[PDB]
PDB file of C-alpha atoms and ligand atoms in Angstrom:
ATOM      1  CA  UNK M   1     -16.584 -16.697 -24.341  1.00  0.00           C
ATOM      2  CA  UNK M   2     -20.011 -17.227 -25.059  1.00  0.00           C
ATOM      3  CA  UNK M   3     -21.641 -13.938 -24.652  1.00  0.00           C
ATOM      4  CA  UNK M   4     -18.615 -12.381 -26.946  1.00  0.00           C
ATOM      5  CA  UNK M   5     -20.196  -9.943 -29.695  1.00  0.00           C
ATOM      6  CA  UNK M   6     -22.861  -9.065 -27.671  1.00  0.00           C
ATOM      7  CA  UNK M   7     -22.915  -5.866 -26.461  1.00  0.00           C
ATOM      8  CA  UNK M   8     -24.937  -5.065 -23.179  1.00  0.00           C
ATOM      9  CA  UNK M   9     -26.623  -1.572 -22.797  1.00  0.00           C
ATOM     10  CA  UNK M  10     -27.251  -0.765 -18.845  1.00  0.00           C
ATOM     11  CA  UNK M  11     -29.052   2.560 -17.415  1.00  0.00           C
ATOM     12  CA  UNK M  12     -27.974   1.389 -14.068  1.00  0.00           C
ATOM     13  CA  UNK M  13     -24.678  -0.011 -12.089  1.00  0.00           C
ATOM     14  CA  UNK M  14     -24.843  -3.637 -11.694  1.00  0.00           C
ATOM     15  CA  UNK M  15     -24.972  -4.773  -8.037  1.00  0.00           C
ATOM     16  CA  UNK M  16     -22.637  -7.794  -7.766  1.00  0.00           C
ATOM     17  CA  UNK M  17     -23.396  -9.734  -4.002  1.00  0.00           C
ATOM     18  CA  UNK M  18     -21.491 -11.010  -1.376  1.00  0.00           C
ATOM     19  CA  UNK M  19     -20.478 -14.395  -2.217  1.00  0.00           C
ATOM     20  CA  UNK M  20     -21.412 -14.387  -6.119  1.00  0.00           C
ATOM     21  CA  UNK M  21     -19.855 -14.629  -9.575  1.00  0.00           C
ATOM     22  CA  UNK M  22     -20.874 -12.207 -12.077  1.00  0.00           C
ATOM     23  CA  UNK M  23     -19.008 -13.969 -14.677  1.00  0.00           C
ATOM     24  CA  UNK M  24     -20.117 -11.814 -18.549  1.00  0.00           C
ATOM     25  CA  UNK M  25     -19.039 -14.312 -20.657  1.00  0.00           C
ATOM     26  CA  UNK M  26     -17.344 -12.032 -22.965  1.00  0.00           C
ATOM     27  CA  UNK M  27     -20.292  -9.606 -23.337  1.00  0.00           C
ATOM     28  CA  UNK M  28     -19.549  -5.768 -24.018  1.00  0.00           C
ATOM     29  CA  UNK M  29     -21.436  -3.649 -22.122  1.00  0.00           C
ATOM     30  CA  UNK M  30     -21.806  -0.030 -22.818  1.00  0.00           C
ATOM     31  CA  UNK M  31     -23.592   1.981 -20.260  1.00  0.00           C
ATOM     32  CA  UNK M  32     -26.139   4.798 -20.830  1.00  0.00           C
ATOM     33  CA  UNK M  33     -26.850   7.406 -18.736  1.00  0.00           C
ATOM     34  CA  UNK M  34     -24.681   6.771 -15.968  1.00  0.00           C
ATOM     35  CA  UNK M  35     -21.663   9.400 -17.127  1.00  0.00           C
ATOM     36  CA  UNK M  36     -19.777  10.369 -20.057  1.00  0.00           C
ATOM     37  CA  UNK M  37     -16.279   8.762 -19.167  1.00  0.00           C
ATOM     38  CA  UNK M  38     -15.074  12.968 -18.377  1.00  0.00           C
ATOM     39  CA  UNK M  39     -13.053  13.295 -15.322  1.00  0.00           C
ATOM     40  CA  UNK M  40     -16.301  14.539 -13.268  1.00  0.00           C
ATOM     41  CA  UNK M  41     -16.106  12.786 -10.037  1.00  0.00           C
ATOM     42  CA  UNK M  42     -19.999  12.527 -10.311  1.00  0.00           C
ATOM     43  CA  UNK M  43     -20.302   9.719 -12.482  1.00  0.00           C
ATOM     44  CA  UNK M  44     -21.909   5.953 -11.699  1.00  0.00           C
ATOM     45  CA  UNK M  45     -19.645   2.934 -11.212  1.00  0.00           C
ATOM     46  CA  UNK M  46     -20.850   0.138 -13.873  1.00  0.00           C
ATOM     47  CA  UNK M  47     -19.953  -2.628 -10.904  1.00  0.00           C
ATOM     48  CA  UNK M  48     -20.091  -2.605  -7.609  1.00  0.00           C
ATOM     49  CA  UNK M  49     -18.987  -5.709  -6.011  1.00  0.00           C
ATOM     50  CA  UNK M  50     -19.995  -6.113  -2.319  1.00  0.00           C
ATOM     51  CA  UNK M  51     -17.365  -7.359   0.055  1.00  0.00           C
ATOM     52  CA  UNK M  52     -16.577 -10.938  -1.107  1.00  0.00           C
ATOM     53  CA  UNK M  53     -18.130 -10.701  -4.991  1.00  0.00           C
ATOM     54  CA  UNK M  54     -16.506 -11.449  -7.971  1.00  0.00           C
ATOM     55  CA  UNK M  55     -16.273 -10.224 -11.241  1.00  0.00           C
ATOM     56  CA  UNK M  56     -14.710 -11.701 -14.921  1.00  0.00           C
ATOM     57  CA  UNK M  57     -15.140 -11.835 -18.150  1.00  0.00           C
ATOM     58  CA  UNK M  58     -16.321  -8.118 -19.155  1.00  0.00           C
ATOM     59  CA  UNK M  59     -15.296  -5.899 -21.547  1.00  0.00           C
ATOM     60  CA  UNK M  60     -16.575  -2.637 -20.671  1.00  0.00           C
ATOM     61  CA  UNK M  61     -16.836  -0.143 -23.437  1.00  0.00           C
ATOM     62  CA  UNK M  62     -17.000   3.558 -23.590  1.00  0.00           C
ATOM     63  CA  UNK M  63     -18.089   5.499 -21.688  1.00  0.00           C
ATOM     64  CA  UNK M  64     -16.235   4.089 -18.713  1.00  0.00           C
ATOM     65  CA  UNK M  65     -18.017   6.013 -16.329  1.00  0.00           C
ATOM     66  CA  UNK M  66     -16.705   5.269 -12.881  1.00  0.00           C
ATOM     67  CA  UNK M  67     -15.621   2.357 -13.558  1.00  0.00           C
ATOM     68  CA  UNK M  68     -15.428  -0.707 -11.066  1.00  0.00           C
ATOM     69  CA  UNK M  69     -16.146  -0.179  -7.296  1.00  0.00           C
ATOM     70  CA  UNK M  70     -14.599  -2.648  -5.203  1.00  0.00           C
ATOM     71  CA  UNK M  71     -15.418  -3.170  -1.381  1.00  0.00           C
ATOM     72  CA  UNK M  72     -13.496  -5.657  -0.079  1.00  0.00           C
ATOM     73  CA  UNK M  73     -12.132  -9.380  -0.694  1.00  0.00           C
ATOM     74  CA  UNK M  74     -12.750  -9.396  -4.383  1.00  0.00           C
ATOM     75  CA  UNK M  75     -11.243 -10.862  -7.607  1.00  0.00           C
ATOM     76  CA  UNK M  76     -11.757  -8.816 -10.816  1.00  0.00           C
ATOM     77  CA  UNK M  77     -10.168 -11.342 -13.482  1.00  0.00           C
ATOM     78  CA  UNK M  78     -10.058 -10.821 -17.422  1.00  0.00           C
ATOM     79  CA  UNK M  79     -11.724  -7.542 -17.027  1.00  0.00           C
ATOM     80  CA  UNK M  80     -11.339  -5.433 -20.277  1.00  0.00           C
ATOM     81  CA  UNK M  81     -11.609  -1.644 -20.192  1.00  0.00           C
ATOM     82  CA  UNK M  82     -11.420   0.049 -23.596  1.00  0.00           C
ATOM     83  CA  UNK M  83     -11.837   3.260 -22.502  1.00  0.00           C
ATOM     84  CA  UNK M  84     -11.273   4.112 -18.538  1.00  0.00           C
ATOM     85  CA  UNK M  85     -13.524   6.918 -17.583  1.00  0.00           C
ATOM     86  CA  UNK M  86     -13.031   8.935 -14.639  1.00  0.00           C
ATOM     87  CA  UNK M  87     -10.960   5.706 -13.507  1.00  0.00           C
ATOM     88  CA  UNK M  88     -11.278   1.607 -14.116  1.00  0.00           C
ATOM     89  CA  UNK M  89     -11.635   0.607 -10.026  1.00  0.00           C
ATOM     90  CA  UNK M  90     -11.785   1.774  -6.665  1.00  0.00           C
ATOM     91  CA  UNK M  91     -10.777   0.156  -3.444  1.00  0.00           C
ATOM     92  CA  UNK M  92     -13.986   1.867  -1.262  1.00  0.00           C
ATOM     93  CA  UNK M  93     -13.596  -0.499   1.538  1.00  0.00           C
ATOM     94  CA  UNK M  94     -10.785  -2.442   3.209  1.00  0.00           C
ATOM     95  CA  UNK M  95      -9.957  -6.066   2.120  1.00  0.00           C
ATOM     96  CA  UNK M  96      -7.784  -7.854  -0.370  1.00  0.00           C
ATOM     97  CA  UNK M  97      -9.082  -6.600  -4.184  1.00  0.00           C
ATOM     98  CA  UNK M  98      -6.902  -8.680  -6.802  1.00  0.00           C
ATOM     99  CA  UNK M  99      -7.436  -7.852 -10.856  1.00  0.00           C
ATOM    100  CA  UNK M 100      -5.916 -10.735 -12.446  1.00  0.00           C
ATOM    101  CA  UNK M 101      -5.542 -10.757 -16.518  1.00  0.00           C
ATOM    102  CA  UNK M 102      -7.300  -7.997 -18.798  1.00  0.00           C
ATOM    103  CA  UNK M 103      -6.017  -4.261 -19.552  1.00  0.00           C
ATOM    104  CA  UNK M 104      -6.910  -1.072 -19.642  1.00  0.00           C
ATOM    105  CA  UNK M 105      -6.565   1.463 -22.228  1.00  0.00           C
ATOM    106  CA  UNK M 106      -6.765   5.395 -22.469  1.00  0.00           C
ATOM    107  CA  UNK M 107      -7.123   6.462 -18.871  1.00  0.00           C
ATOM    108  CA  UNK M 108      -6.683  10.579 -18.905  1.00  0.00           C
ATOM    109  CA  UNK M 109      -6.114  10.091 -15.126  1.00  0.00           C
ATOM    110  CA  UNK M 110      -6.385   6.915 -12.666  1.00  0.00           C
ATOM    111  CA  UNK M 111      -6.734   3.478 -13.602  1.00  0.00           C
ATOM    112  CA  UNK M 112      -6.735   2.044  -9.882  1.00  0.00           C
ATOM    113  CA  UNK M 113      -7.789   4.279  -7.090  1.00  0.00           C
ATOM    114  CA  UNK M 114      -6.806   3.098  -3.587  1.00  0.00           C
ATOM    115  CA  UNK M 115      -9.834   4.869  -0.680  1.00  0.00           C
ATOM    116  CA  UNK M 116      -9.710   2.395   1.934  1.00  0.00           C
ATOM    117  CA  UNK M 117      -6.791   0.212   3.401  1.00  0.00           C
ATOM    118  CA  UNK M 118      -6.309  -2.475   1.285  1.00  0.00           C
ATOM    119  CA  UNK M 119      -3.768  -4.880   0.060  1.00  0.00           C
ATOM    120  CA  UNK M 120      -4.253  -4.483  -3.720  1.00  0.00           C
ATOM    121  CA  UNK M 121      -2.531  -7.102  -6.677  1.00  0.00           C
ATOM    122  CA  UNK M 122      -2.344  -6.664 -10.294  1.00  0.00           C
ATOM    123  CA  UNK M 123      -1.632  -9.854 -11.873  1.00  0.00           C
ATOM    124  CA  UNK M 124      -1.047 -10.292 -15.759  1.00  0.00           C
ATOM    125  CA  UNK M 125      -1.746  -7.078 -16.812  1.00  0.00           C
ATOM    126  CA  UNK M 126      -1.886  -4.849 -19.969  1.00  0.00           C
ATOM    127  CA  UNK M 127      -2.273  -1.093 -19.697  1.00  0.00           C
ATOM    128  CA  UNK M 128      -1.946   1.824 -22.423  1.00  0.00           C
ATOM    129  CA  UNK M 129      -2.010   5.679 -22.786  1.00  0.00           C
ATOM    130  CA  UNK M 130      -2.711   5.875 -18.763  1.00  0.00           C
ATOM    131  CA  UNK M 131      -1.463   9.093 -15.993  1.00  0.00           C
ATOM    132  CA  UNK M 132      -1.318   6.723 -12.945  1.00  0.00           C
ATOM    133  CA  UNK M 133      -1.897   3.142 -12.646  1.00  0.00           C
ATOM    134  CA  UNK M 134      -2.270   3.142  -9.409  1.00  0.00           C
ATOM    135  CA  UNK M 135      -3.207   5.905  -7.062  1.00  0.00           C
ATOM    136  CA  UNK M 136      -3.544   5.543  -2.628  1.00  0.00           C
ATOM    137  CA  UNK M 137      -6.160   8.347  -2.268  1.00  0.00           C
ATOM    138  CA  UNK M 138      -4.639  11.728  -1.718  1.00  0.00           C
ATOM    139  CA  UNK M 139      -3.061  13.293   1.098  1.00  0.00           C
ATOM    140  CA  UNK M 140      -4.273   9.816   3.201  1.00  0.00           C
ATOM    141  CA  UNK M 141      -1.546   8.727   5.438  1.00  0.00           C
ATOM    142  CA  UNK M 142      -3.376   4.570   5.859  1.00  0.00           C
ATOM    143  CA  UNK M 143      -1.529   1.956   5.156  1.00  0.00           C
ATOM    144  CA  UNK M 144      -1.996  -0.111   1.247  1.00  0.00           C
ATOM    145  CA  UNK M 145       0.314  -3.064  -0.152  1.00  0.00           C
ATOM    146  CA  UNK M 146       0.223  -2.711  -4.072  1.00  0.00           C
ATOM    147  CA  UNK M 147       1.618  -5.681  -5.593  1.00  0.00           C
ATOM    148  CA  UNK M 148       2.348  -5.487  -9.486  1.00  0.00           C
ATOM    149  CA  UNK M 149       3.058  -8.831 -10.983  1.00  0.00           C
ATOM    150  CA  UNK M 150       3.790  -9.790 -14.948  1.00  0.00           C
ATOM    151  CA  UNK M 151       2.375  -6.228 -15.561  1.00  0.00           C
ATOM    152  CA  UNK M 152       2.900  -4.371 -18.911  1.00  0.00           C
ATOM    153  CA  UNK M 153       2.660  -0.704 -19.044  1.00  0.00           C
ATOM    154  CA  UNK M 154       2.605   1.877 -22.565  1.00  0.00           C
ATOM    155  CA  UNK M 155       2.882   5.314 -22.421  1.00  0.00           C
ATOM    156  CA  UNK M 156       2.425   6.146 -18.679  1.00  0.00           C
ATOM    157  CA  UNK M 157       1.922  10.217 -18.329  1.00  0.00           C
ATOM    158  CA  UNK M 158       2.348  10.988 -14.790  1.00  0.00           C
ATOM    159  CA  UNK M 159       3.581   7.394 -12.492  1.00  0.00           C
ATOM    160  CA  UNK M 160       3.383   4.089 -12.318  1.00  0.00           C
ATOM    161  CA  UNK M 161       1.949   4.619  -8.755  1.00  0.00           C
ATOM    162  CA  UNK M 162       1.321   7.372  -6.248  1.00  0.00           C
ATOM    163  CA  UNK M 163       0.846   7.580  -2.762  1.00  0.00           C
ATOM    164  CA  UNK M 164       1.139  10.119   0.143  1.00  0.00           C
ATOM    165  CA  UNK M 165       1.610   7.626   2.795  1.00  0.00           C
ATOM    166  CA  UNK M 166       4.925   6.846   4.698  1.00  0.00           C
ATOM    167  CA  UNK M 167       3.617   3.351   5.673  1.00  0.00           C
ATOM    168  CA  UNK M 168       2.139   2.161   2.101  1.00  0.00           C
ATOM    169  CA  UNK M 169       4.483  -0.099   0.271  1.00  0.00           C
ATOM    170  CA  UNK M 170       4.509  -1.045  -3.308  1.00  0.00           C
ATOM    171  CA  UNK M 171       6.078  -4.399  -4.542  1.00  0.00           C
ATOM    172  CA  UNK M 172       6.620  -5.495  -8.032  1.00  0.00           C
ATOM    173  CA  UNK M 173       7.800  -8.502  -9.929  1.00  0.00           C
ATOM    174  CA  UNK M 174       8.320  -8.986 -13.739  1.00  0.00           C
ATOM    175  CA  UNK M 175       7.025  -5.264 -14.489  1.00  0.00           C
ATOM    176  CA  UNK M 176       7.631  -3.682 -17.947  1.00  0.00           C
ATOM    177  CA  UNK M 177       7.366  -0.281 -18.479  1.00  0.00           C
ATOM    178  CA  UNK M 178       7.493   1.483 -21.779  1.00  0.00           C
ATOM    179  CA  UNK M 179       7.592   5.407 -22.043  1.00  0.00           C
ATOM    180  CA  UNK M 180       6.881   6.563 -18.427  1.00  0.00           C
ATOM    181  CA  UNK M 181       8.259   9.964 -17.223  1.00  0.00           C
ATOM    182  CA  UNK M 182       8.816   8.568 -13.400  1.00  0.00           C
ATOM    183  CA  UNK M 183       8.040   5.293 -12.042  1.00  0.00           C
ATOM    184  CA  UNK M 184       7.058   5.997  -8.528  1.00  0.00           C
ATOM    185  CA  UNK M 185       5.886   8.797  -6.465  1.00  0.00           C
ATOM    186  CA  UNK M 186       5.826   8.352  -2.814  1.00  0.00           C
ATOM    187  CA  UNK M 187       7.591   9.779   0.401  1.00  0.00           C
ATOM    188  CA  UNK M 188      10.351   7.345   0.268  1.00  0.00           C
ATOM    189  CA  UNK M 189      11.877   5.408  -2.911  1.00  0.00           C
ATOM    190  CA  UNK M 190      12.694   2.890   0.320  1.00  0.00           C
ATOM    191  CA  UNK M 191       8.943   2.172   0.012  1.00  0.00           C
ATOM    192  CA  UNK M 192       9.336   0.308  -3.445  1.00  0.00           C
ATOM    193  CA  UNK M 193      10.611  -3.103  -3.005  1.00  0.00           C
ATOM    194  CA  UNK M 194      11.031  -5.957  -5.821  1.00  0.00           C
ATOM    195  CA  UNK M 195      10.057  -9.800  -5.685  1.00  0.00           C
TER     196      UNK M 195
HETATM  197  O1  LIG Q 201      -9.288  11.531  -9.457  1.00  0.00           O
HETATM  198  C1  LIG Q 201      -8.680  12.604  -9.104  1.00  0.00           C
HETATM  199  O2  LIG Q 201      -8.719  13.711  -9.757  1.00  0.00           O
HETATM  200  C2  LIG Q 201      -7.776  12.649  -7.946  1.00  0.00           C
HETATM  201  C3  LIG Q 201      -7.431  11.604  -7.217  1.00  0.00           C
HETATM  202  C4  LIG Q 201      -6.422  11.726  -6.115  1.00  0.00           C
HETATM  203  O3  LIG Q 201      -6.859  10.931  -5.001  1.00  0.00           O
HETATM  204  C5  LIG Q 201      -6.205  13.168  -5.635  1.00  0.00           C
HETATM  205  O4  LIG Q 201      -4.887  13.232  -5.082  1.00  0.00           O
HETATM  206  C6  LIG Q 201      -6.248  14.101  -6.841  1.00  0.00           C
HETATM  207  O5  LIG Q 201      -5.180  13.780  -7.740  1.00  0.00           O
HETATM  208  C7  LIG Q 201      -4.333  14.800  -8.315  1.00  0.00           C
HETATM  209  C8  LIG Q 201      -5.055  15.681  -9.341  1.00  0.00           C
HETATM  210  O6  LIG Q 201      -6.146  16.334  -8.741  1.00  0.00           O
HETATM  211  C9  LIG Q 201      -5.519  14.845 -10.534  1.00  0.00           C
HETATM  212  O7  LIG Q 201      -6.161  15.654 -11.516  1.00  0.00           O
HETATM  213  C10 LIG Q 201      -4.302  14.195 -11.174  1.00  0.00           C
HETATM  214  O8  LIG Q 201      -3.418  15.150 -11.686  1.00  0.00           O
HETATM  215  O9  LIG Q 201      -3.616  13.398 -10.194  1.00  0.00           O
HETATM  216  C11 LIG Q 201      -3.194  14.112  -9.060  1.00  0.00           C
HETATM  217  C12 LIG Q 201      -2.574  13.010  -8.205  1.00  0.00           C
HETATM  218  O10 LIG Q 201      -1.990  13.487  -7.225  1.00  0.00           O
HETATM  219  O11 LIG Q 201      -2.808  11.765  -8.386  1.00  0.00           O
HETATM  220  O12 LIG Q 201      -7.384  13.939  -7.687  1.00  0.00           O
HETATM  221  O1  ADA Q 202       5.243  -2.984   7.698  1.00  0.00           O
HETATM  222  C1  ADA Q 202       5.120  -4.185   7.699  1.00  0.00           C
HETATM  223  O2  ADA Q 202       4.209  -4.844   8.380  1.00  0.00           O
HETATM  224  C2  ADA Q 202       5.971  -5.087   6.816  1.00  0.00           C
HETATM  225  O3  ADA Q 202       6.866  -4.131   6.182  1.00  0.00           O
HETATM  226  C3  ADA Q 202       7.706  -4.774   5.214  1.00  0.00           C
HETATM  227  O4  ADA Q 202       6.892  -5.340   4.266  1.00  0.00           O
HETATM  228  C4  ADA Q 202       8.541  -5.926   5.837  1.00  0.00           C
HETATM  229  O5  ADA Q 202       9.208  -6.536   4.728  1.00  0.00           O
HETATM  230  C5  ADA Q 202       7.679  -6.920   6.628  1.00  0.00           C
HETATM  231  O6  ADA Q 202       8.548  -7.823   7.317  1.00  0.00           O
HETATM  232  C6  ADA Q 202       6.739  -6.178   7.580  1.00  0.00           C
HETATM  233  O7  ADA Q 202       7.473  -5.516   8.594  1.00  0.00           O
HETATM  234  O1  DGU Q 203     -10.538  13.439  -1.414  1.00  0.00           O
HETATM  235  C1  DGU Q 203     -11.062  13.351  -2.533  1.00  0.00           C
HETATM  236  C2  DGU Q 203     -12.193  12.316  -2.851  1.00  0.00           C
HETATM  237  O2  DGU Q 203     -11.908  11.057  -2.242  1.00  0.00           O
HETATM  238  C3  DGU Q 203     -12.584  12.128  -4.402  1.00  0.00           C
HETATM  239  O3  DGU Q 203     -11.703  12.807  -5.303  1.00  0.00           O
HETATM  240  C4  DGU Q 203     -12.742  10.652  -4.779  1.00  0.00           C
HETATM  241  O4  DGU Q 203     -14.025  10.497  -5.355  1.00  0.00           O
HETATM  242  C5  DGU Q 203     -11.668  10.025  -5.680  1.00  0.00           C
HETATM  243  O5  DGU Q 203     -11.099  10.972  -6.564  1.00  0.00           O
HETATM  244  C6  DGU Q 203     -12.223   8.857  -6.487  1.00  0.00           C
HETATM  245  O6  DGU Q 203     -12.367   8.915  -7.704  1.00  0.00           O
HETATM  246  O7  DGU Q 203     -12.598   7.957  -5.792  1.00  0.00           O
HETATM  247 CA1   CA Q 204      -9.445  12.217 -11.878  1.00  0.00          CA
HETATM  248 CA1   CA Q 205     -11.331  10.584  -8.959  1.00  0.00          CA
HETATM  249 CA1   CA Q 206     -13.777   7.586  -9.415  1.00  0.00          CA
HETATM  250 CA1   CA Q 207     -10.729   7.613 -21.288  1.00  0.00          CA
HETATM  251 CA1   CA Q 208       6.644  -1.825   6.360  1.00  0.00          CA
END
């Protein structure tokens, strides 16, 4: 990548619009002022990517702040998190939200928090020293589809995934996991299919 060594500083989130590619090239970008990577829930998103934007090539350094905020019909591909702050990406608005290729690293809590009905892929991905990968929102009873394909998973604290609704199914295909204490946490193991 072209940008890669640089290392953006931001004081605000980056606005990414319907229809676009923000594609970084490789750059780094550490943000300032926008959170400390803590488990507040008052921190800034780095991204947010309106309904139909894009996203790729980004590592984002610590602090991770809140991470990517996804509303809807958007593909988040070779996305690098060093550090996940409070978590790495949010589903805020219903749509299809895929994050193909990348990783994430050191999440204390979330990587990938589900707000919003969604049907939600991980596709050739790394993650390490995480509690959940993937998290529906709490106590919300709408329906996601998590799909978890040619994923790789270290040291997982709490779950693979999590969810508190009867109707949300999770589906996975070629998923390694290393050092987890329970793979997944919803009503009904019935909810967790293979492909
Ligand atoms: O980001 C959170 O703290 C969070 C997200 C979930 O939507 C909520 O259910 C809640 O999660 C709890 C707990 O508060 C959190 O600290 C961690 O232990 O995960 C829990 C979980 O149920 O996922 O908070
Ligand atoms: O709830 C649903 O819409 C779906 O549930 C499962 O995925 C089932 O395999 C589908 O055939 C469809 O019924
Ligand atoms: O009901 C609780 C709220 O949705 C709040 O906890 C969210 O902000 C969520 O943790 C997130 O990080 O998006
Ligand atoms: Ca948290
Ligand atoms: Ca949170
Ligand atoms: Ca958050
Ligand atoms: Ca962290
Ligand atoms: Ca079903």
């Amino acid at each position: 990548g072209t940008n890669t060594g640089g290392v953006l500083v931001i004081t605000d989130t980056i606005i990414v619009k319907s229809g676009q590619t923000y594609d970084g090239k490789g750059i780094k970008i550490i943000a300032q002022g926008m959170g400390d990577g803590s488990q507040s829930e008052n921190q800034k998103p780095i991204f947010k990517l309106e309904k139909g934007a894009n996203l790729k090539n980004v590592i984002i350094g610590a602090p991770g702040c809140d991470g990517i905020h996804c509303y809807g019909d958007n593909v988040v591909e070779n996305v690098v998190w060093e550090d996940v702050g409070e978590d790495a990406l949010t589903v805020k608005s219903e749509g299809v939200v895929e994050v193909i290729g990348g990783s994430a690293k050191e999440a204390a809590d979330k990587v990938f928090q589900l707000n919003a009905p969604c049907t939600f892929k991980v596709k050739n991905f790394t993650a390490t020293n995480i509690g959940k990968l993937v998290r529906q929102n709490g106590n919300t009873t709408f329906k996601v589809v998590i799909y978890l394909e040619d994923v790789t998973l270290n040291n997982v604290k709490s779950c693979v995934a999590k969810s508190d609704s009867p109707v949300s199914e999770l589906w996975y295909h070629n998923l390694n996991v290393n050092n987890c204490k329970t793979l997944f946490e919803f009503p009904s193991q019935s909810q967790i299919h293979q492909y």
